[PDB]
Amino acid sequence: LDFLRDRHVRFFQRCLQVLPERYSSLETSRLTIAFFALSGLDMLDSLDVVNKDDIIEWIYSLQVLPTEDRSNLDRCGFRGSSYLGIPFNPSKNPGTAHPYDSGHIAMTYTGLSCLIILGDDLSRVDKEACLAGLRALQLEDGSFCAVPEGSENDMRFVYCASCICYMLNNWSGMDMKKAISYIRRSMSYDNGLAQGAGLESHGGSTFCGIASLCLMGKLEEVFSEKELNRIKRWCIMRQQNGYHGRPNKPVDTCYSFWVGATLKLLKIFQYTNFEKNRNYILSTQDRLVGGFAKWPDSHPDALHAYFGICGLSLMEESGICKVHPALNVSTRTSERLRDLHQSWKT
Amino acid sequence: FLSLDSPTYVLYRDRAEWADIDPVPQNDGPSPVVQIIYSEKFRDVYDYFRAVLQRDERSERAFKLTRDAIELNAANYTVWHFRRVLLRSLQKDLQEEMNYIIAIIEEQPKNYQVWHHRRVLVEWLKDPSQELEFIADILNQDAKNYHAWQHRQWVIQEFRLWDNELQYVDQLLKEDVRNNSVWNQRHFVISNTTGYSDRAVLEREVQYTLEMIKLVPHNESAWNYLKGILQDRGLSRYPNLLNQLLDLQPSHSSPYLIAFLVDIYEDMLENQCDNKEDILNKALELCEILAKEKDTIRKEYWRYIGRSLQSKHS
């Protein structure tokens, strides 16, 4: 059918407003929910329906700044929300010590990402503190953790680290050699990329791996042509109509981006079947409340609404900005970032 | 102790044991974004959680408070971390915690924080005795649960429990030969034990797979395994495979088989085989068969593959 654009703009608007206690489990990931909504509006060219200034202040209130003594550098970055109870501070005063307050790699990523989308120039971001915190998250094997206190480690966070270094236009945030090693070691016998060595190759980790390399500008340098051909084969085999994340698994709207974006980075998305993909994505569109779901006749959420739209974007949907396949922001935004970077270089 | 849905539940603000603590509220400032509304009970538990956290109070009451915080939201990684801090400080019985996390994971098998918690516990105890069985149960409500398989590989690798995994794999593959997770597990076991260099093993595996393919010819997983264990040694270095496949084509055909064939032919052209120009034609003929009738959805891809072979071997 058709793309209910306005319906989706309202949907994202509501996401930025208030949610039912039913979404309590997203408390520590509120910043990424914000990202889905903001980048989603950006992708639909509707950022005007929100107060960029208010939101920018809220975001900055989530930054874990270094304290006076700077004894918490290894823990700087961004929080997913204010759940710890720290007094609201839009990165105005120095950081207030707290035994358990520290950033989360996915939040530092979506946070910076949101700031750029909203037009902020990142001047209030303590770049060095963030990079210091990032470094602290990398393990001996090259992968990353989400928080300094410890957590699981895998490709998801390698991608987060890559995006952070890229946006701050400084790769001192990671030991790139070790990260690349981790990404190579994750390639499966079936040629896809898994969350880690030995694990089942997966659409999500393949995107994270490939996108990370592209962000480092080392795709061609890390994988041979023969290897890239094998990876391309694995990826393009994911299309059933829409895309699934693993062989013999049902399709899921968000993979239209995870896999689709990987195919785009590998310059072969053009050889996929657009109609069946578009048709599937639209079949998961909630015509009443707006947004998209993973499967048709399923409830919509911010993640699928966003990735479903980015999926449509990949095929240049009428009414949607082109999405930067590696950075996960609109090309328009990736551009403003380019200018921003030039600015600093003076 | 006092369950959150107990008729006699009492807000922490009304509990005597907590009178000395000032609850700490959360504040999103002037204009909150993506604000979640919380019930009295919910906000109450967390206002006290913030209080205890802020003071890094390693008390028994704090430990009990985390149970409630977790019941309200098991996705709060900070709560689990603090709970681990307390588990140590109060030297709690870890075998008991194992029962706790076992119940939690069963209710929320797709939660990252709970699987991480269990892994930390197992490391602490250095006891993997109940892991394989626990995971097998979780895999019963979802044989493809990525968290379960990841945890399973960690345990097996960390405590070298390879002895029975290949058998577990054979069993699951019988339950559903299309489970891509099980095929990956099979490769995981073998490559970490015998390896595939033992021609006896390679032969057993190729034979095993061809058998599974014959039972269900349309199975990407089986084909990917077969190509996976041979692609690096050179697909063209196996003359009897090319023919055994061409013999299947008649009855057990599928786009996966045709694809395998194209791949064999390309390996040949890659190794300057005999009949360069003739082989390339056999390839191109298949590419087109894929594009026009066998794997139409990838029509443009296959034609792209074909054009690639032509401009590379002519």
């Binding site: 990931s29 990424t32 993973k294 699928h304 | 990252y112």
Partner: peptide
């Protein structure tokens, strides 16, 4: 029916 990526 969702995708918990974190």
């Amino acid at each position: 029916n969702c995708c918990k990526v974190l």
